[PDB]
From a paper:
Calreticulin (CRT) is a 46 kDa soluble multifunctional protein that was initially identified as an endoplasmic reticulum (ER) chaperone for monoglycosylated proteins and is also involved in Ca2+ regulation. Similar to its ER membrane homologue calnexin (CNX) ectodomain, CRT is composed of a globular domain, into which a flexible arm-like P (proline-rich) domain is inserted. The globular domain is made up of seven concave and six convex β-sheets forming a legume lectin fold. We have investigated the CRTs of two distinct parasites, Trypanosoma cruzi (TcCRT) and Entamoeba histolytica (EhCRT), for which a pathogenic role has been proposed.
Residue numbers in the entry: 23 to 211, 294 to 349, 351 to 366
The structure:
């Protein structure tokens, strides 16, 4: 039911790409401030003004035929991020050493910010193109840990959770540009006979084989935690309570590091 859970207690099983000789360095770390010196540990990007590209393979490939698929992970931008990504990717069969921005993914999911620009990416590869989510939700611009959870249901509905709470909810067909128009001209009532129905929008075209972090950061220091993937929503949200729902401790740790200032 839970296919995968990266705790980032270690990073040896994650492979860093060879597509460039200058990808940024990463480490296991709890950051400058933390709710717990051990449980707050995670994947930390260390170097300013770098690209990052590292990945790990699912022990077993992941499918979602007539079944739910739930993705969750957290990013902590404690560094005062002005420009940088904090999103992950789910990819079909690929070579981790040539992993880069152009590598074919099925899903690109997570926070991204640069200047006054801010949104949560939910990008689905469908029918040979990457389809950007039509809705634009800004993620919280603070130094605290935030969790991003996505439910892709077998009825082609979806739901996006930020910090455990529902932020967006709707239909894949309506909130992305995946299919042709149902009407030949909108509001005419005349059907478009070329329209093709797809009951498998939610379904991965090929089985999913890797998770990867492919981001650019100007101000580095971000920490990734708890990459969870499964087929049951409550199960994942329960796991988010266990791992993230550290809230009270972290916020107090943040105030402590802010009273000094
Ligand atoms: Cl997007």
């Amino acid at each position: 039911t839970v296919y995968f859970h990266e705790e980032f207690k270690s990073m040896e099983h994650w492979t860093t790409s060879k597509h460039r000789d200058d990808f940024g360095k990463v480490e296991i770390s709890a950051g400058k401030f933390y709710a717990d010196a051990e449980k707050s540990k995670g994947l930390r990007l260390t170097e300013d003004a770098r690209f990052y590209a590292l990945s790990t393979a699912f022990p077993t490939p992941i499918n979602n035929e007539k079944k739910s698929l739930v993705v969750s992970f957290s990013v902590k931008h404690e560094q005062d991020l002005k420009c940088g990504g904090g999103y992950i990717k789910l990819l079909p069969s690929m070579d981790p050493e040539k992993f880069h921005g152009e590598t074919k993914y099925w899903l690109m999911f997570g926070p991204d910010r640069c200047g006054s620009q801010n949104r949560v990416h939910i990008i689905l590869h469908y029918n040979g193109e990457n389809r950007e989510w039509s809705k634009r939700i800004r993620f919280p611009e603070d130094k605290l840990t935030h969790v991003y959870t996505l439910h892709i249901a077998a009825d082609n509905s979806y739901e996006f959770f930020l910090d455990g709470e529902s932020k967006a909810k709707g239909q894949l067909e309506e909130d992305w540009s995946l299919l042709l128009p149902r009407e030949i001209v909108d509001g005419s009532g005349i059907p478009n006979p070329d329209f093709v129905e797809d009951s498998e929008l939610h379904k991965v075209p090929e089985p999913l084989t890797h998770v990867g972090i492919d981001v650019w950061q100007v101000e580095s220091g971000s920490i990734f935690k708890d990459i969870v993937i499964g087929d049951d929503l409550k199960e994942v949200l329960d796991l988010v309570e266990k791992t993230y729902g550290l809230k009270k401790a972290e916020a107090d740790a943040l105030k402590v590091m802010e009273d000094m200032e």
